[PDB]
Design a protein around this ligand. Structure first.
Ligand SMILES: Nc1ncnc2c1ncn2[C@@H]1O[C@@H]2COP(=O)(O)O[C@H]3[C@@H](O)[C@H](n4cnc5c(N)ncnc54)O[C@@H]3COP(=O)(O)O[C@H]2[C@H]1O
Ligand SMILES: Nc1ncnc2c1ncn2[C@@H]1O[C@@H]2COP(=O)(O)O[C@H]3[C@@H](O)[C@H](n4cnc5c(N)ncnc54)O[C@@H]3COP(=O)(O)O[C@H]2[C@H]1O
Lengths: 103, 100, 100
């Protein structure tokens, strides 16, 4: 198992490509994105998107978060949070030695 | 980074508005909801997943308790909680920001 | 609250039924699946799938992960990771005595 930070970004759908570009410029090895509905305090739910990015370091997750927020969160609704995770399998994330290599 | 409990509610799609109403009455700052599936009690049956970030464990438990008592003896559902830290979130962290 | 491991499997949509079968054979008490995207090997977004499975033990989650990866991950793209969670309500996960 390889330690990882799971960075979650929930924001307005129109920022999809802009945020993907930031994630791709970060060094991150991938991301997953999904459609969601969002309410923040006539249905009032709006369409949003949620990105999930697993990063090897906490610093990379914060860089992505910081860059997204500083660029867009003055003007667009969003939330960014982080969860601890462990990657058990992931050719790209762990490399070809796998996620439980020794040393 | 502000500690948060991430409360997840997975249940029947027909309960969407009813659960949202509970989350809106709770003081929670917001929620996300998505369409998901599972095999269904009966190939994949559509259901829904709510994610609510709460500042306290007690708020997450109050929501969970309310939803579960009101609906989960009559409808299928699971509620669980994960630890998260919010880095950014104007509404969640307030104007003081997430140094909380 | 009952401790749980949340196993997450993100992989190619064509594997949906095959991975479900492995989860069903594992002893796991359920799963949720959703439609997601990633950038794709080729810009814009390629459809894929995400499974979330809550397991009572860490070893059951790893058994599922090991069976999926060995069987499919030399030939199909995927990532499997695990988060700690606590189940607050879940008739199937916790049994009729409740999550405590
Ligand atoms: N351990 C777990 N990990 C991740 N997600 C979980 C889970 N337990 C439940 N879920 C999610 O919550 C929904 C309601 O599940 P519940 O167990 O109340 O109600 C279930 C249960 O009564 C029965 N069922 C499904 N799978 C089962 C299994 N493996 N063992 C026993 N009963 C199952 O079918 C009903 C509807 O299930 P469906 O999968 O459509 O819908 C599920 C699924 O999306
Ligand atoms: N930044 C990058 N660097 C190198 N190669 C890249 C890449 N982004 C995409 N790829 C390549 O394309 C495949 C499919 O990626 P996609 O984003 O569609 O779909 C991904 C994605 O939704 C999810 N995933 C992968 N890594 C992730 C991460 N670090 N965080 C969150 N989700 C991830 O797992 C699916 C299968 O991923 P997998 O890595 O097996 O396989 C990847 C990988 O071989």
């Amino acid at each position: 198992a390889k330690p990882a930070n799971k960075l979650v970004i929930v924001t307005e759908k129109i920022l999809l490509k802009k945020i993907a570009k930031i994630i791709d410029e970060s060094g991150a090895k991938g991301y997953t994105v999904m459609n969601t509905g969002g309410k923040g305090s006539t249905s009032d739910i709006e369409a949003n998107i949620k990105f999930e990015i697993l990063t090897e370091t906490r610093e990379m997750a914060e860089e992505i978060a910081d860059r997204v927020a500083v660029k867009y969160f003055n003007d667009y609704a969003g939330i960014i949070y982080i969860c601890s995770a462990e990657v058990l399998y992931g050719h790209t994330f762990c490399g070809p030695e796998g996620c439980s290599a020794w040393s």
